[PDB]
Amino acid sequence: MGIDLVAGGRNKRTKRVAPKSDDVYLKLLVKLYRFLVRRTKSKFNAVILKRLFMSKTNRPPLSMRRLSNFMKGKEEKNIAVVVGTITDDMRIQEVPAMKVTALRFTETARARIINAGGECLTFDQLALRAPTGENTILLRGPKNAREAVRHFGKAPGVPHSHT
Amino acid sequence: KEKLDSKRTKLSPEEAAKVKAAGKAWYKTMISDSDYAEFDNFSKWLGVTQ
Amino acid sequence: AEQYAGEYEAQDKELVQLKREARMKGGFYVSPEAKPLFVVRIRGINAMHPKTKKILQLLRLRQIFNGVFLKVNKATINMLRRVEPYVTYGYPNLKSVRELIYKRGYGKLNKQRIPLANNKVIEEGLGKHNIICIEDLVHEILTVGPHFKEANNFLWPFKLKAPLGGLKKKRNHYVEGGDAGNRENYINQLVRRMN
Amino acid sequence: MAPTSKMALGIKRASRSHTYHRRGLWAIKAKHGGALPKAEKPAAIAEPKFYPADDVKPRTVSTRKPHPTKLRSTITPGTVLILLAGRYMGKRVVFLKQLQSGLLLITGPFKINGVPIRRVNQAYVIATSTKVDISKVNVQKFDDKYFAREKKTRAKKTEGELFESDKEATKNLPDFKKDDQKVIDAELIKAIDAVPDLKNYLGARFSLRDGDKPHEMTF
Amino acid sequence: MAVPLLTKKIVKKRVKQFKRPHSDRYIGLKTSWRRPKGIDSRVRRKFKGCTLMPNIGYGSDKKTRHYLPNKFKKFVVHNVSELELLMMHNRTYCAEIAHNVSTRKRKEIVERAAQLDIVVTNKLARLRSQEDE
RNA sequence: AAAUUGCCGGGAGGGAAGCGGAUGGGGGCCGGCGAUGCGCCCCGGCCGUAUGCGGAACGGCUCUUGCUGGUCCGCCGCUCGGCUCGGGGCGUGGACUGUUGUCGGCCGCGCCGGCGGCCAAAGCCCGGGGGCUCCGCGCCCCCGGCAGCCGUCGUCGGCACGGCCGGUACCCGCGCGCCGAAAGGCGUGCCCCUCGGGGCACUGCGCUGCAACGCCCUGCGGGCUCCCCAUCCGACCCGUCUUGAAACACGGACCAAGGAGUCUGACAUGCGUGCGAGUCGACGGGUUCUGAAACCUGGGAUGCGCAAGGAAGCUGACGAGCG
RNA sequence: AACUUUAAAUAGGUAGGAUGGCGCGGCUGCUUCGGUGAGCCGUGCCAUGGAAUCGGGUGCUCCAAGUGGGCCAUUUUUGGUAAGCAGAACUGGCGAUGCGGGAUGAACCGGAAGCCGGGUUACGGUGCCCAACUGCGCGCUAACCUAGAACCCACAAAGGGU
RNA sequence: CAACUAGCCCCGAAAAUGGAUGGCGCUGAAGCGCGCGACCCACACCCGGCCAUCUGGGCGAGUGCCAUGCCCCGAUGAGUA
Q: Which residues contact D2 (CB under 8 A, 6 or more apart)?
């Protein structure tokens, strides 16, 4: 018909619960979020749903360093929602406690975080006790950083004049 | 609507009123040829000069 | 509307009688216009330059016999005279718009389009300018007063029928006995074939 | 537009009256309405479905309305009709009454012209300018319930019995109808002979010649 | 609901029948539809009369998909165990005896099927297998 | 098995033009078509609950322990009653499929009527003046009183019919006291009209298809194939090349069976899986149900810091803001 | 055209604000002979509010296929007598396009195409082919040396006729 | 009476397989120019039904289970490489 009309038909489609979701535990967890979100007022739990949909190859590991650094008395020991996993490459003995909830924890993290304080909470519990999703920060995690933006291949991706 | 309906209640008995208004107006002008008639005449006289 | 004509009936008296037997006119008094426009797309998107094509999209006209109302502006009619053989336009009277909005009306985006049927014109539609209901909306938009360019803020296309008794030829403008371009009297005639 | 106007610019003026009449009793079906009726012990599956009750009531009334007015163009009892469809089509007949079914009782007198009592549809008919006077004719006996054509249940008898094949599926002449028809026909003949040459005219038949126009012909 | 949808499917038919082009004059070229890959085909260009192409829009109503014309959903029934599943449905599903099953085993399927009251096509298939026209 | 060939049958016809098909109808050929439905009562047939008894799988739970709730079968006691197959007896009428009536929605269809715009005026009778004609009739023009009716613009109003789709399966529609075959009407207050009538206010539940004919078996609607007649894009049939293939481009008599993006090593991205500052068993050794599987070693490889050509580098830990 | 004082139109660029302005007060190796100024930091104030219109959403990143011979028409235009020619400029098509129209035609005209019923049109028609007025109205035409009859398009002129 | 203006018709206007307003034929046209109505008419347009795709919803509290399910939306869909 139109080219204008075709413009509406060629729209977006990011959209996907991931091409293959092998993990049954991931798959049931997103169903739990799916049920609660439409039965609650929570913008925050809706954001969680997207980050656990499309990819796992995008979910960022977050070290104990920097997790500690943004809860520095300007967040009074809330709940840290970590999309990917906690990793343990630091020793400071961090914050004297903190309740950290995540999708996955490393085995080292399970021991380390709880023996610094608080409790390693599961995302099942996050959904249970906060479908409301309040007093909460999705703490952080980067992959956009120095290594592996477009910095790929063999010899990266450059200052930029020619490549 | 509601708004349309309230205007349509007004319109329906005033269909009769339009016919009555037209016929009565014609009768009224000729009853006298004093002041009343002359006022009607003036507008027509002026408008048919030019 | 009637009393405007009635005012000039009372005041003027130099216009009518003698002037048929002569040329020129004299003085007396003048009736103003103040009319929004309605624009329906006569001619398709095939074989036309792309600046004009952008204008059709901009004023939304996305298929033939699409309709969107436009405002009173110098700018709006400058824009339409780059589009003129591809559209026909003019003001349709107050009454004709009322009996056309009902037929081919739909809701506005902010959702999809849930139409102007019983329940869903009363309980849906926003409006902070005025009451968003069908009869109210037509009254506000065509009087072109305060924030009634946001009593425009349409559905987004009126999907007009193809005209009964057909078009006048597509290949000419209004003057040469074609359809296309400006004409206030005969646009309402056309839209009352496109019921 | 004109008939519907009262209801349209009222909304439910007729139906308002009924509630207020009920309320004239005192205090009633507001209280009774919550308590009223059955439910809770199902059959089969969910029971998601349908009818009896409520639904039947407006539908029966609405189906009654076409029988005069809409179909009718205008036609008073004792108008002469042309049957353009039906079996007896091409016969001119006299109109006895309009049934509850909406089908018309007619009868041409049996001896002169073959038309029996019969039910015919209003929709078929052309209303002619002639009227035959049906002042003192007892059309009363013939009613809607009178015209039940027996089905092929079993034998015509009482029921429950082993039966034989000699039923009439699409037809049935009751003996009683034949006796009754003679009586009603007798009164009609008196009216028919009063105007000359009408009696022969009914049996002859009307049809449109080549070159005749049905539009121009209109009785 | 279900009944007018059945009427729409059966009466209308898009039994267009998608025949491959030039199937008629080359015997080896198959009746089975395959999409004309080349530009040069008239069928590809969508000329009418050259046999219209299969598209989704030709497709029937969702409810009336994979139904027998009786409005029953057809199920090929291999053995006695599978009849128990069909029993839940009754009216909605049909039993049709499989090709593999031999004549003696067909009989036990029929008698059980009768109890479920899903007599249609099950009995018919068995009767032929006995000896019958 | 395909191809081909033979026989024979059917269609068709020896007055007629062929892309071999589609589209429509008829023949020819053949499969299909609730077991025949429901309410009620009478007889015949069979069983028995409640409650007591006697043996048990259960429940909520508690969870030592406790209290409330079980149902069922065995089959006796004590009082009553019910159901099912068939027949009898009565009422309602259900079986594919085709047809007709109707209500609602959508759309067309022809016709009739009103008001206003366009100072309203053509118009006609009455009255007055002028011009032209200057042979006069006549012609024209204008102005004041007037039945009158007009072309065009806008709007509203009313009818008469039909197509198609659907029967409205949750707020579309509507009933629930009464009369009236029927349709239909029947409260009351208010206000306008103050006439005829009108508009306007005032309860909650339940719920979405009505009339009719044929026959289901006798018998037959039908589906499907070929043919004939009707109708049609028919760029020659497809593929390829090409801007363009029907091409006076190229290949292909026909058919069967073979027959062409594979597998690997090393790589990038994406996606999945594990584990994660680590990670990767399997060169190897242990062991064995034996080419396996299981177990395990130090690692080595890759990463966890870099940057230089190289030597090398205070030696890369003080630690960051803003939108 | 390779001249221009002059000098269009259609094209083309920029701006029309919160990614902004203003107040407060900090620093400098700059800049000022001078805290003079400049830039950049903390803190405060001002919303629909900065023409019109639209956004059946938009913004952003990674990665890979095909393409790498184009062809045509209207318009503009250079070479050439010209060409269905060779070569540019703009745009739409074909290529990647049937269907309807032009008898017929890849590109012209109309319009981009799910599957159907019913309505209604476009282009183009209404004597018959061929669906549809041998309809109404007002002219012109009598063609023995080619009567005339639909863009592109199937050609056609100077010049002559009492 | 003369010189002009511009309509149609005539001349100028001659090619080869016989031939093409497409054909027949058409002269108060069925021609040519033009007006006015009515009418005809594409997979276009509308309305309805329906398919998938896309978009937005909705419904799992278990103990009928496809919950990658089911159900309500509306818009869109030619298609070579």
A: none
Sign of the CA dihedral with C187 first, then C188, C192, and C195 last: positive
The total of other beta-carbon atoms located within 10 Å of residue C138's CB is: 20
The residues facing A81 across adjacent strands are: A101, A138
The single residue listed with the structure tokens 């304080």 is A117
Contact D142, D180 (CB under 8 A): yes
Beta carbons of C41 and C56 less than 8 angstroms apart = yes
Distance of CA D127 to the CA centre of its chain: 17
How far is residue D139's CA from residue D134's CA, in Å, rounded to a whole number? 9
**How far is CA E116 from each of CA B26, C16, E122, E124, E125, rounded to the nearest angstrom?**
89, 93, 12, 16, 17
Contacts (Cβ under 8 Å, ≥6 apart) of E51: E18, E19, E21, E43
Q: Closest approach of chain C CAs to the CA of B14, in angstroms?
A: 17
List the structure tokens of D36. 């009223």
Would you say D118 and D88 are in contact if contact means Cβ atoms under 8 Å apart? yes
Q: Which of D76, D184, D191 is nearest to D138 (CA)?
A: D184
Length of chain D (residues): 219
Nucleotides of G under 7 A from a protein CB: 11-12, 51-59, 61-63, 91-93, 95-99, 109-116, 119-123
d(CA C81, CA C140): 27
Contacts of C190 (CB under 8 A, 6+ apart): C40, C88, C163, C179
Cα–Cα distance, C138 to C69 (Å, whole number): 11
Cα–Cα nearest to C68, from C77, C59, C79, C80: C59
Q: What are phi and psi of A31, to 5 degrees?
A: -65, -40
Residue E52, Cβ neighbours under 10 Å: how many?
15
3-state secondary structure chain D: CCCCHHHHCCCCHHHHHHHHHHHCCCCCCCHHHHHCCCCCCCCCCCCCCCCCHHHHHHHHHHHHCCCCCCCCCCCCCCEEEECCCCCCCCCEEEEEEECCCCCEEECCCCCCCCCCCCEECCCCCEEEEEECCCCCCCCCCCCCCCCCCCCCCCCCCCCCCCCCCCCCCCCCCCHHHHHHHHHHHHHHHHHHHHCCCHHHHHHHCCCCCCCCCCCCCCC
**With contact defined as beta carbons under 8 Å apart, do C179 and C82 qualify?**
no
Measured distance CA(C102)–CA(E11) in Å, rounded: 35
Distance from chain centroid for Cα C18: 35
Task: Please tell me whether residue C154 adopts helix, strand or coil conformation.
Answer: coil
Nucleotide closest to residue C166 (CA–C1'): G121
Chain D, window 192-211: residues with a beta carbon less than 8 angstroms from a chain B beta carbon: none
Kindly give the residue spans of alpha helices, DSSP state H, lying in chain A.
Answer: 4-9, 24-37, 43-51, 107-114, 123-129
The encoded tokens of residue C149 equal: 């360019």
Within chain C, strands assigned E span 37-40, 66-70, 88-90, 158-159, 181-182
Give the residue among C7, C144, C14 at the shortest CA–CA distance from C69.
C144
Q: How far apart are CA C143 and CA C72, in angstroms?
A: 11
Q: Please state the separation of Cα D58 from the chain's center in Å.
A: 19
Reported resolution, Å: 5.5
- Whether C65 and C159 have beta carbons less than 8 Å apart is answered as yes
A47 three-class SS: helix
Chain B contact probe: residue of C13, C119, C121 with most B CBs at under 10 A: C13
Radius of gyration for the alpha carbons in chain E, expressed in angstroms and rounded: 20
Any D CB within 8 A of B2 CB: no
> B with C: 3 or more CB pairs under 8 Å?
yes
The residue type of D185 is: D
